[PDB]
């Protein structure tokens, strides 16, 4: 389940103002936060499981999924994956926590690693509630190095999320 380019009579493209966003939805009990994401270079990035590819409304416009991978658990709207930085495996990083029902706050942490058969992946020991996935993680220069939301629950009950990230994709050729 890795990689796929979506199929999206035009529509008005939604607001892609740079920043961190809350992904909202309406349920049988009212509106709530499904997840979060980060808008950069006119493209919306988030984990795959937050919207599962659902079209998103932003302003008076709409944003359609462009690319996504369930295995990578990443998804972007409006264009190719734009994030192009990753943890240097040395410095501390900061998560812009977009927790449902609470104001955004930054928490810094020294990443550890997930040892994969294919190498190592930065991993932050931060435990935040369902719906926080998509929250961006940044380095000291303020660049988005990855996303929060996909990891493991250790036997001690503490949650550890990998710094979910992919490489920048080129524009369609």
């Amino acid at each position: 389940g890795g990689g796929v380019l979506w199929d999206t009579k035009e529509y008005k493209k939604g607001d892609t103002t740079t920043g961190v966003y809350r992904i909202m939805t309406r349920g049988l009990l009212g509106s709530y936060q499904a997840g979060a994401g980060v808008m950069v270079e006119g493209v919306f990035h988030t984990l795959w499981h937050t919207t599962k590819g659902a079209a998103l409304m932003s302003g008076e416009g709409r944003l359609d999924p462009y690319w996504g991978s369930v295995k990578e658990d990443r998804l972007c709207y409006g264009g190719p994956w734009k994030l192009q930085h990753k943890w240097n495996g040395q410095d501390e990083v900061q998560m812009i926590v977009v927790e449902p029902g609470k104001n955004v706050k930054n928490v810094r942490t020294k990443p550890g690693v997930f040892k994969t058969p294919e190498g190592e992946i930065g991993a932050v020991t931060l435990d935040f509630p369902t719906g926080t996935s998509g929250s961006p993680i940044v380095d000291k220069n303020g660049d988005v190095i990855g996303l929060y939301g996909n990891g493991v629950i250790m036997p001690n009950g503490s949650y550890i999320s990998a710094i979910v990230q992919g490489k920048r994709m080129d524009e369609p050729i």
Binding site: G1, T25, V38, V40, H49, A54, M57, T109, F114, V152
Partner: protein, 47 residues
């Protein structure tokens, strides 16, 4: 039926709270995008 609302700038906060330990964990990533610890029920591939 899903929308988004901007809620913050993208930036490093000098006075940000500190939390968490740096761990070294062995895992596997299945085709469904699930990380697996050795003793998790789902440890052992899956589609």
């Amino acid at each position: 039926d899903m929308w988004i609302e901007r809620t913050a700038d993208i930036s490093w906060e000098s006075d940000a709270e500190i939390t968490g330990s740096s761990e070294r964990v062995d895992v596997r990533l299945d085709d469904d995008g699930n990380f697996q610890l050795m003793n998790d029920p789902g440890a052992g591939g899956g589609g």
